[PDB]
Amino acid sequence: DNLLKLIAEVKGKKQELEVLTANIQDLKEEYSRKKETISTANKANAERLKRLQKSADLYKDRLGLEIRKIYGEKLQFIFTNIDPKNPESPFMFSLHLNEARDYEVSDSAPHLEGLAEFQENVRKTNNFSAFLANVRKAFTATVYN
Amino acid sequence: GLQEAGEEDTRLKASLLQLTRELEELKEIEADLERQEKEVDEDTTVTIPSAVYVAQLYHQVSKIEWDYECEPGMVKGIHHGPSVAQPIHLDSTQLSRKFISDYLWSLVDTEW
Amino acid sequence: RNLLELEVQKEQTLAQIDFMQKQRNRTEELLDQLSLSEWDVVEWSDDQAVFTFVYDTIQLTITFEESVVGFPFLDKRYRKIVDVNFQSLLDEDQAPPSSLLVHKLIFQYVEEKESWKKTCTTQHQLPKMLEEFSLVVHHCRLLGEEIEYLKRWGPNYNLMNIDINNNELRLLFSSSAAFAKFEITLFLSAYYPSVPLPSTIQNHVGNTSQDDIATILSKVPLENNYLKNVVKQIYQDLFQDCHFYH
Amino acid sequence: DFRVRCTSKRAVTEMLQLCGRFVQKLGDALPEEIREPALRDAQWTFESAVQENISINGQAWQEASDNCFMDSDIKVLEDQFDEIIVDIATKRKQYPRKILECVIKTIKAKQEILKQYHPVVHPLDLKYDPDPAPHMENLKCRGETVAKEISEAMKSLPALIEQGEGFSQVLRMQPVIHLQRIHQEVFSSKTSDMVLKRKQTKDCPQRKWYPLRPKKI
Amino acid sequence: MSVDPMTYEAQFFGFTPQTCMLRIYIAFQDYLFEVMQAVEQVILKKLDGIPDCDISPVQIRKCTEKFLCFMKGHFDNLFSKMEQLFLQLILRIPSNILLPEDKCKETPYSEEDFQHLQKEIEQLQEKYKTELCTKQALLAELEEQKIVQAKLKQTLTFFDELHNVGRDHGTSDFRESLVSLVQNSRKLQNIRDNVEKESKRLKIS
Amino acid sequence: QELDRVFQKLGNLKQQAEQERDKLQRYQTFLQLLYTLQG
Amino acid sequence: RQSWRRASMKETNRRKSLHPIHQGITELSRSISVDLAESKRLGCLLLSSFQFSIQKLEPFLRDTKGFSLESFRAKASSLSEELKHFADGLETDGTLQKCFEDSNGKASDFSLEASVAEMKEYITKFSLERQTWDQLLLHYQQEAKEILSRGSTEAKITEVKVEPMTYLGSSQNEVLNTKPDYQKILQNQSKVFDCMELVMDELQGSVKQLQAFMDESTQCFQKVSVQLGKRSMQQLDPSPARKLLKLQ
Amino acid sequence: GTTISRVKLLDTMVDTFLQKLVAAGSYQRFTDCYKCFYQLQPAMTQQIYDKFIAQLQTSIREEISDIKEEGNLEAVLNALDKIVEEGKVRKEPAWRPSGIPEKDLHSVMAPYFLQQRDTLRRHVQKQEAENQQLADAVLAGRRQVEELQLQVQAQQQAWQALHREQRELVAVLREP
């Protein structure tokens, strides 16, 4: 009677706990596969970044030029291996894309008046290689001053 | 079996409490997995645009393609600066960085 | 039922679209097969047509009679030409002598066909005149190419120098192997190479005489590469086995 | 000469002897004492008086003998012979000297004229009608030009050969460099006008020889 | 008898010996006649001196004529003898004796030798002129040879200066320069062929 | 709704057909002028 | 100057006979005219001699005792008349005229005519000899004077060109005959200059061909280099700078 | 005997002639021929005979002396004696005139022609000797001209040898 109702209640509570914990283990398995996928994605992206960093470091080392990004949406170019007395002298200039979708030089090292003379030409020709070759030549001339 | 049914009832409601603790541990694992997923996305997005475009800008500025699978301390590659491309074959073990950089920049065309 | 009918109409429209696109592709292929003529038609209009001959250096402007108002349904083959125009786009300041010679000869032919103002009045005779002109154009351009070839590979055939004055053409042959040096002057015409060339020889060094040159000229057939063949035959007859002495 | 011109001596002698007795007949009247002497003296006187007036062959009686010799012809012939002997002897003695003098004069004159004989032989004039001095100068200028050009060519050709070798070497490492993983990752990717315009319009190589006008602005 | 011309004696003495002999004869007979006539005149004047001269002039003249004939015959004989004496001894020139004027005639000279000598002299006269003309022609030939040699030297120094000019502008040897250029051209042609092949392969692929 | 969507699609296809028909006469008259000029 | 000839002494008078005692006997012929015939002259001379003898004997013997002088003259005249008749008769018979005829004593003559023939031969020979002598003298003197006169007219500047036959007898005939041509060498010099110019033209042409050759080679190299550069460039973006800068 | 002079021979034979003539004219013959007058006065006949002999002999001596005077006989005979005594060596007959002047004059005019021939021979020999040297110079000049021409030909061939290399280069740089 009442005891039968109570044992029926406990049996119901039994298989409900069993089902719920079973779905808990199912979600545990899904979580483990998710974390495995996340970890392997991390490893793959990290290896790709390491290869890219090796290439960029080779470029920076051989050329001496160092390209970095700084706040204010500025791209900072640092030229070294120019001054013979110390090749570690950083000859830096900052280029940034303006509001009008145009490149423009920000500064130099030291304060050099040959800022625009290359920026109009790089705006028109869009020749970055010759632009930076001319910039390096200007820095070299500035060194001997 | 009133008392037996009651003691069994206590046992399984306890089983509910341990399985709910397992569920909350699972939920904190869910938060953990979400934070690593966001970290993956942020990392990849930063890395690939940044590194790929920095390398491509380096190469565009230099017009130089390196031989990455060469022996270390051995500058090898192709210079597209001159009108006729010429092979870069230097040796950093005998040449200073100053000379190497100056020579590499010399081969770059300065004409606008 | 309405939805089914609209779907059937849409399918029929798509089939028509595919059919006309296939027809377009076939038409474009037929064009690409037949875009290999001597002349280029840059512009046509209901009143004016424009043709550009070799490498866009010669402009042929055809000007038609104004279309009659109210009767656009008449045959397009009956349109009346009112003015035929020839123009040269060559930059004479930096043009090489071969280019100037080609343009001079082709305009000599044009002035020879000064009657084209009265001959070509309707659209029927326009293609025939086009062929008549284009043949001479092709021949003259081939002659210019021959001139450039001989200006490049002349010394291989002992032809040291070529000078382009008015229609005369001076070929300077010299070779110390046969101790022969002479200048052959060739009177070129718009009818090259069909018309025989009235050549003359000036013997600078050696005993080379006119008869040998005339025999060599008559030997060479009057066909394409006539000048190149004459040069080759002259080298063969006078210098091929003479230079073998080493 | 009134004396009688006779030719015969014997006849005159004999006729006087015949006339002798005509004178001798006178002696009959002479006295005997002087008969013969006086008569013979008279006879001799008669002979003398008749003989002194007789010329024989143009000569005197006592000079012309009894012989019939042609005395005048003999005398003139002998005189001519002696004169011709003397003349020819003088000629033999004298003429050779003058002959020798004339011979000497002729010999000396011949020697002098032979000495004075001057033959003239002008050398044949060699013609210089083509003067090669401008030709030589032109040849030298051209040879200088080509010498300079050949020196430049031998200097330049090895440089181009080296450049071509380097470019071929670039070509041969281009694929292997392109196969590098790092390289691959880095380099990962109105009026009614019927235009009647076709396709395939480009700057053909023949444009080099046919420069179009820049609209003649 | 043959009369001796005596041309050689006449050439020596200048006169014929017979002339002087006959003049001596006439002088001797004239002197004999003169002396005998003088004696006759003396004897007649002596007869005229004495009275009644019985010696008639006729008788004494006959005696003188006889005595004259006596001397005439004897004188003729003796005079002929002494004329032969002259002609053999005094006026005679020995056959082995030559006059000084004929001293050049001692050696004979045949006419043929004289003609040969004349011909030889004429031939030598011709030869002298021939040799003079030959010498003149040889001088002309030397002058022409000198001119030709001068032209040849001019041409040779032209080549020498041309070679020096070529050397002064790098190329001292054209043949080796051409050989090196040919070799380098072949090498560059090989390089160009390789380059064209690789470029075509890149184009297609 | 489905009928309206199909009608809109049919109208768009008809507009495309009209555009292609207008663009057809271009190459058609082009080609037949090249025929007349070539012969 | 003076040299005696036999003719020089014939003119000198000689005496081959004694002068007679009697004088004027030679004048008896003078007193007789030559108009009479020579026979009459002989008769007159003989008669004159007879009278001269009579008149000479008339006083010679007057001293003799007794002298019939008158009868002597009478008989002398009578005998003179008779002697004139006798002379006339002797003239008539022709024997008186015989004094004018010559005999023929050839017995003593033949040697004399032989000697005269020898003399004629000798004088003819000597006349020919002196004629030849004179001819030789005139020939030689005329030759000498002609040579002298011709030489005097000579000695001017008479240049004579020499014909080749003059050198035929020359000692150096071979050298003269073998004289090489010299103008041909001068022409060959210009020929050599011409052939050098032809070689020069050949050299210029070869240099021009080589120049065009490496020019073409350089153009080919540059074209392939820019093609390779474009092939390398095709993977990159048009501008890495914009993409890098736009990063946030 | 010694060589007696001609004038002395003449004098001796003239004296002998006078002696034999006066011997022929004996006094006994003289008186026999003149017996008519001799019968009257023989003495005066004797002196007149002596006068005749003396006068004739004196006349003969005067004549011979005179003729020797104008005839220049003594000097000519002495010169002849000198000529015969200098030329007595020759025994063979001496030369005599031939009768033809040409052969007589040949001996006279031969030596000078011989001298002229000798002089002309010397002159022509000297000219030939000079012409020998001249011909030697001609030969040397011809040899030098030939050598110079050969040198020019060598230079020409050296410059023309470039043809093989030029044709080889043309072969290397061949037309398309």
Residue numbers in the entry:
A (entry chain G): 80 to 224
B (entry chain F): 86 to 197
C (entry chain K): 2097 to 2342
D (entry chain N): 35 to 223, 250 to 277
E (entry chain M): 1 to 205
F (entry chain Z): 183 to 221
G (entry chain D): 93 to 340
H (entry chain P): 29 to 204
From the reporting publication:
Faithful chromosome segregation requires robust, load-bearing attachments of chromosomes to the mitotic spindle, a function accomplished by large macromolecular complexes termed kinetochores. In most eukaryotes, the constitutive centromere-associated network (CCAN) complex of the inner kinetochore recruits to centromeres the ten-subunit outer kinetochore KMN network that comprises the KNL1C, MIS12C and NDC80C complexes. The KMN network directly attaches CCAN to microtubules through MIS12C and NDC80C. The outer kinetochore is made up of the central and evolutionarily conserved ten-subunit KMN network complex, comprising the MIS12 (Mis12, Dsn1, Nsl1, Pmf1), NDC80 (Ndc80, Nuf2, Spc24, Spc25) and KNL1 (Knl1, ZWINT) complexes as well as auxiliary microtubule-associated components, such as the SKA complex, that vary between species.
We subjected the reconstituted KMN network to cryo-EM analysis and obtained a 3.0-Å-resolution reconstruction of the KMN network junction (KMNJunction) containing complete MIS12C, Spc24–Spc25 and all folded domains of KNL1C. The only components that we did not observe at high resolution were the Ndc80 and Nuf2 proteins, which seem to be flexibly connected to Spc24–Spc25 at the tetramerization junction. At the core of the KMNJunction complex is MIS12C, which comprises a tetrameric coiled coil connected to two head domains (MIS12CHead-1 and MIS12CHead-2). A salient feature of KMNJunction is the coiled coils of Spc24–Spc25 and Knl1–ZWINT that run perfectly parallel to one another, giving the entire assembly a prong-like shape. The Spc24–Spc25RWD and Knl1RWD domains are rigidly docked onto the top of the MIS12C stalk, and their interactions with MIS12C are further stabilized by extensive peptide interactions with the C termini of the MIS12C subunits Dsn1 and Nsl1. Knl1RWD-C rigidly docks and recognizes a shallow surface formed by the Dsn1 and Pmf1 coiled coils, whereas Knl1RWD-N uses a canonical RWD protein-interaction groove to bind the otherwise disordered Nsl1 C-terminal tail. Overall, Nsl1 uses two highly conserved motifs at its C terminus to bind to the Knl1–ZWINT complex: a YPLR motif binds to Knl1RWD-N, and a VLKRK motif binds across the Knl1–ZWINT coiled coil. In our reconstruction, MIS12CHead-2 directly contacts MIS12CHead-1, resulting in an auto-inhibited MIS12C state. This state is stabilized by the Dsn1N auto-inhibitory segment (residues 93–113), which forms two contacts with MIS12CHead-1: (1) a linchpin formed by the WRR motif (residues 96–98) of Dsn1N, which locks into the hydrophobic pocket at the Mis12–Pmf1 interface and connects Mis12–Pmf1 to the coiled-coil connector-α3 helices of Dsn1–Nsl1; and (2) a zipper-like interaction of the RKSL motif (residues 107–110) that bridges MIS12CHead-1 and MIS12CHead-2 through both electrostatic and non-polar interactions.
